[model samples]
Target chain A: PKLSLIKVVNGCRLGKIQNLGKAGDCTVDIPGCLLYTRTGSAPHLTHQTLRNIHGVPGIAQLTLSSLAEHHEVLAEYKKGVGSFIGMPESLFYCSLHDPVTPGPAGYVTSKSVSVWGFGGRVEMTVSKFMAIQEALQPDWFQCLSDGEASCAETTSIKRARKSVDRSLLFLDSCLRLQEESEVLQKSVIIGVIEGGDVMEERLRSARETAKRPVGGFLLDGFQGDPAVTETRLHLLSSVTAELPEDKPRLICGVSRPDEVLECIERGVDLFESFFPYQVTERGCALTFTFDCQLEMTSFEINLKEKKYQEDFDPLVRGCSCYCCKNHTRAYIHHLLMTNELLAGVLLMMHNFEHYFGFFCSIREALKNDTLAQLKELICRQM
Target chain B: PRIMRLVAECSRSGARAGELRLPHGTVATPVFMPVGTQATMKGITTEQLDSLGCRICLGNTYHLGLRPGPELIRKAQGLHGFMNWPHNLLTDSGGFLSEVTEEGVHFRSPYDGEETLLSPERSVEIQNALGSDIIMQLDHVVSTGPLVEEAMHRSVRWLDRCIAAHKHPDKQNLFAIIQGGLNADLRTTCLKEMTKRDVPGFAIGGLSGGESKAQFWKMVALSTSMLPKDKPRYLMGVGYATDLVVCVALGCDMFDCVYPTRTARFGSALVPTGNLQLKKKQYAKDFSPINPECPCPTCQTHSRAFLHALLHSDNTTALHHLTVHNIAYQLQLLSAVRSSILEQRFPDFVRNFMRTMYGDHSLCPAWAVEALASVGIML
Candidate 1:
């Protein structure tokens, strides 16, 4: 329910989010924190192993695209979606779509938006969406938005004006429901700001959303026109400038180490921590360094390659993650070659461990006014 | 010196509680070694294995040798340090062929089209570099047919070669395999030659490869009765709960199989009442854990419903949970049986186990009943 700034260096604001949920019982730090996520479960991990990892995120992220189909099953249990998933103690934020598994080309109308599920393609209305949110009973939830990339692929700034308008309408109805429903009385409703490419439309969307009685803001479908690096920072800076600085700004498509610092520099405070799962699935390990390592060549290595068969070093030297502390490149290479599930398991452990370290270092950099230097070191590998 | 030490023996049955004094650690018998291919057993890590109270694990020489060459492992301080498992490790003699000769076997590597071979000497060589607590000799395996007698006789011949090839008798205790198929006379003949050698343990091999349950138990019973009682008796490739309990009653000390881990991936969870197929629709809303009395981390956190739903989504995590539970079921079963022998109530434990597993005492498998009778424990 609140955000407080600790420091801001080069517009990379380090902050804390506290007094969250119905009882004000939860809190999370910002500028370098991430949202914990799972696709069915933390990729290739059971709870026993899941609990052993260091720096697991405090806030859990659940997208409706995955949990909507289980609404009835979770509803019958009466403890909410978090408890039903066996993560009852975790205060979660329920979003619309998974960034990893983007729903098929979005088919949206004025009354509803389409999200894919285990039962396949569920077209959701504002009323039905609120009902699912009530069942989930998250710490906070995103306001429904017409945030789709397939309005002729977010290219038709022709669709930009309409995307902004529909999101406002969605926010209006969601706020109204929060007032009337007992299930949502103590919850925080996050407002959405969308304007595909037009800066004018995007600023209007951000300013209009900032005026609402929302807990925070979710910036969606606004990653600039050409979708290049500096363009994104410019777009985000302009877009974020129009919004109020008191609330947190959660953005999508900015989790990579290089892009993460750039986005943070533009005043975005939240990110989806799912880069590890994607890296894990593709049979690669995270070899990227946030610290200055002059010998760094590439960001990662494909462990399935022939050269690694005799390689006897850990994925990242001096890394104390379970995977690196015990196993070697030769052994992990053998796992990937033989198509073992443990390959993904071990890589995920190291990736999560390293990604978490990057976030911790970013916080240290922000507080010390060394954000620019940290950015250079991380971006060097690029 | 014998590697195995006896703790207790049931006066009413053939069950004997013992401990294996291996180079790395000591293991309580009758123990079940889950097969760890490469380094880990499928998805379960060595840390999780230790958490499950697993004191021993079986590794494959064929797969480990091929994936990362044996020399690489040797330089990395053997498979024990490489895999980082601090427990008693046992390895199989990777086998069989384009040819099975008096000298060795020849075959083409399936990973590539090139040729590869694993003679008795080479098998011993690979195992020594790998540095496991217990290693198997390269035995000629054949079915219960016209070739059984020849394979049995040749397996005895290979044992001598394996003993000669072993460079570190003080560390890696090479175990000889008794491969006589279903012929008890050939098994006795193979055992005669195997026991004469000063190996630390003996394994009953070349059975459980599509043999009758009735015929399987008798061969195991015959092998254990004839083999040196002071040494550990390993019943190779038996992991089913019923099979393990019966073989334990017949005094077999060690067992290993891919069934417990393999079946987990296919959605079956091992329990005292037998495997509950989590894929079945009956489990879709069964909010209870897989077993209410079981004490694994999986059962403590996950419900049958939550696990069943994963099959429709991402079942790898589901398989990981079930694999942990299945291994726990094995560890607990054997641990309880071991203590039962020490307490002089092993027969009571067996009778109750059969009744609960089948839902009635009369419904117990006939082979199990006759096998227990052969050891003086009648249902």
Candidate 2:
């Protein structure tokens, strides 16, 4: 077995938080190997703007511009935005569009399309996305595929199977394009596994996607509503049982404190920083008590309400995210009151930091296999 | 506390420079108050407002009564406390509410399905509860509607009731509103009546809700000339780039509107030259800020690429930045007017501004142009 060390450091900051303070806990050392130590930590902000605001220490892959899209724009995005933020060797997540067998009516009507929209029209977006994938060769990438998971439609299990099949087709489409490219090569490709409510389908999807020539696996079709933890765990364990243990598993779109712990117990090594973004969009902040236990508190503050006037308390107490450490509810309220934009940026920064850091702590707990204790801690209130 | 005074005079043409001394601080005359209607200014926050040098803001009495309710704000020590707005706030009586009603306005509570009446006294009381520094006398206003006389009578009745309800004469300054549909004679008559009320200030109300520019400025100019110059005159709900110049030349000292901030949230900024939509596809790769000439925080920092990313996504942070930039740009324009007044070159300022802004008068309403020309002492 080839071993490379990625020294992540005591704390590394990405986007605005990086500009604000120190965050992170790992490092990398390739030593003498054909492969570079590919180590990346979760760097997501509550909102896209704030996500872009963070900075990763000693690296610049995750910058304002790279995060400006949730698509295949990573080829030049990492390099272009890295130049903007002036950091190199830093890792950033390059996401993919849900590959649709048949594009939506609005796909052609969309006024603007970029790397994210490659196969969005004629399944070309998937292949175009793969071409960019080949060119940029990100340290880590989420494969492009469709997951027809939108809450449970009990009778629609067959349709869900078709959705999973569409994803496999999209993956094959990507591989076909990858073979045609000369310069478009490198970076670890993370395959996606999709299964809608059924357990057998999840195994089939996972086992099948695992056989592909990819570095890791991403379990999709977890929960449509991120707030639902029960569905997530069911999907996680069923799919986890099928994947190869040696490679890492990346999970995208699992929100809520309880769901995070449950996913970790079932073996998810990565997550997308989207929960905080959702919170910021609704004009609320994550005020959960992450102390003795993850107690979901009244951290839910509706900024449009008049309750926050002159309340100079930080968005969250004791949290060291860029927003909490540097700003207060009163200040943010003023921005919201006056309709200023920095409030979202700041809120996203803290939300992303809190969420991503939460996962890193989970990784530490997993080392001791204290998954159940972590679950109890996450589910119990402070 | 004694009532703060305004020694308003024509600084140059129609624009007047005066000072408004309040509990927080003194704001320069002819100041533009960004409309934070729903407590929050659509997307921006107070921190950005303060950074943009905002001294005063405007909130709506109607919206407050509906959402947070006056009791909540009063408990929080007024709208300023409830919304955490430390600077000055101006609460509109929301006489606009009256337009929705006929014999009398009854608003079905959009929040709780309850019914609420917004009479003049009720409006004044609500403003007091909201604790805005400057409050308006409830007045009936009609735009270009055919029922001008009915609108005129209602507005007058409301203003009279508001004046009667204004018991604490020394605490907060009340600005009396002059309302008369598009009828110039009716506007003059209403102006004389409002001036006769001899409140702390006078304001031109009941225009620009779809009225033609000719009708809008004809009334603004006629009313401004008749308005007593010793007290500040506020132009209600009208803060377009050209309107600011036109009203100032007509001797108005203050203005409040949601135009700049709202436009910004929707992805445009009011530059002296013209409004620029920063989120358009054309601006995606562009590296410049909203404005190169203006040094508002948004323009000074953050690139077009960053702004486009914000607009491209449904990110509130980017929306908030646009709001800040829009408000900052408005403030910058007002500042220019004040400096030009001090130099006795307000007319030149208006001309220079027009040359850049109204290249095609088609986009520039003739009445807006005429109103702007009034700033330069041109007939």
Candidate 3:
């Protein structure tokens, strides 16, 4: 019941809107440090997938954003997280209800919640985004404007600027509503920093969004270019450098463990637990020995191998996760071979355990300055 | 006049094979009955029993009267329907319970803690309610031991009351129990009184209760000689592997015990070479059959690996399978004895069976042979 509208600076660049959550978002007790994890398709990005990350257990924090309509998945997610007890993780966000638009209630906090910042390919106008943001009291909200430019797009800097400006306008309007309405007070809102490949726009969005009362900032890079690594790092490092050190800086869709570590070092504190799901969908387990190696290639077991049968050993040695400690590879192999319910339970347990473990390891390495060794342990070639 | 015919006899020993016609059906002499104490015979299904060529099985009237209740059994068309057994059923009359439940001893129902009473007449009443083809009469049977004079005298009185209270006199065959507790003179007195009642069959009860094997055979020989030749003599509760072969040689027509079923539950499958506990680690990868020579379904369709799997899991199927195999073992042994009798080689069969199965038939008591010889069995 802690609803309040407050504005924070350049978080707009994280989405297309830099100054959106300057007036805050909902009335709930939204923890400032709570990470807003994202999901990308391929069926591995789910609350269940990340519930058990890295052998250590973690609870889910959910958002109301989703496109999956598998009745089983939808119904299950709706009952809150954890099939046993209620846990809401991976804060729900949807793109259909959120579109890029401007008006009395124009804004969005993320791509999943609103389409305000569609990938520029979609023709949805900017008016609808504002309307949806006003109605939905999201803990973390995004903006409606697209500046996700490729490194080759020289217009990327100019477009990134426009996206930042539009986000500021949405933030100003949200600020007005906060002053007038009692219900629009005390919600922790995030301001997205949108900068396709431009460092100046990224810095501008970061500094501007920092002046508001928003909970955090996001760095959403452009799509289509698989080689957006250098450009992404530049945009992320420059923007994160200007953002407030106290507030969380989130990066969307950076799921691979190495990307997670690199962004963490760049001052990005929160990320999506979708990498494990991606690994699971390929019919491979997240065998990543997350204790070391931050390289993207290291996993503990090559689950795709047939030698698991008659092996009678746990998936990963020394890992006390439910999947590893109690059952054998032979059992899981047989289950997967037979296509049984037990296989999903086994794989899901490991996937979630690894994902949750990754976040913890990230935080530990950050605090202890051991991320270098940890990175080598998890990411180096096995 | 049609006199008795020697159907089959072994040549070198007194062991003879024969069949006697009862009002219900023909029962192969020297047959073994599996004891279904709780009307289940433990895990073995009635169908499994039939496959093992089991014709007659024994049920405990005491267990049925307590569980599923006698009324429930009768409503379900008697014990046979409740347990779904179609073969001939010979039920015990809690005559043992009568000895177990007395004033000072005070035996209560192990199941429900109900104050249990086992008088001669009540035992008969339960047997009648169960409605088996053969019902045992309530007679006190004490273990062979130092004299319990008072218990013995009380048993004799209980026998007369049991006879008087036996209802369904025209329909069911009531087997009178001869209880002498290893005393030859006492057995003679009991048999004389029991024969006067005109019962169709006689069971030599009160043997095999912690008594030495010799004492058991002595009682068997004494009772077999005393019982009338025309009537069948059932050696009640005597089904040790070697005991069965020797008793049949001594002219005992029937026997029942829980040895096979109980041993199977412990993972011990009864084979001609004593027994095998399949759960031993040596059997973990064993691909051999339970008994390679046997033709039971369990052996034919499964390997030792399957039994090892079952034994490891403590599965009910293991118990059922082993029970079938053991029962089949007993039946096959009896069939060999029967076929030997037809060849008039009963003595030779006993000699060979003892040499391999029961030590040696020549070591069998001289009196057992003399008693069989007295009954026209060739030695």
Among the numbered candidates, top TM-score falls to 1
Model 1 bad stretches (over 4 Å): A21-23, A149-154, A223-232, A292-297, B38-41, B109-114, B144-146
Candidate 1 residue lDDT tens string, A273-299: 877767788888888777633312256
Q: Which stretches of candidate 3 lie over 4 Å from their true place?
A: A1-382, B1-6, B9-16, B20-24, B38-41, B97-116, B143-149, B358-379
> Comparing 2 and 3 by DockQ, which wins?
2
Q: Comparing candidate 2 with candidate 3, which one achieves the higher TM-score?
A: 2
Ordered from best to worst DockQ, the candidate numbers read: 1, 2, 3
lDDT (C-alpha) at residue A45 in model 3: 18
lDDT by residue for model 3 over B91-112, one digit each (tens)? 8875443225442223465566
Give the TM-score (vs. native) of candidate 1: 0.95
- For model 2, how does the per-residue alpha-carbon lDDT over B1-379 read when each residue is reduced to its tens digit? 3233444445546666678887667888778888776314354445556767888988877766655578767766677765566788888886562234533466665556766667788888888787778898776554456567666767777777888888876667788878776777777777766677758777787776787777778788788789776777788788787878777887778888878766766788777777778767776666666688776666665666656655664344455566667777888888888888777787777767777786654566667667765554542
- DockQ values, each candidate: 0.57, 0.09, 0.01
The positional error of residue B299 in candidate 3, measured at the CA in angstroms, is: 1.9
Could you tell me the C-alpha RMSD of candidate 2 in Å? 8.5
TM-scores of all predicted structures: 0.95, 0.69, 0.47
lDDT of 3 at A248: 56
Q: Assess each prediction's global lDDT (C-alpha) against the native.
A: 0.81, 0.60, 0.56
Give the DockQ of candidate 3.
0.01
Give the candidates in order of lDDT, highest first: 1, 2, 3
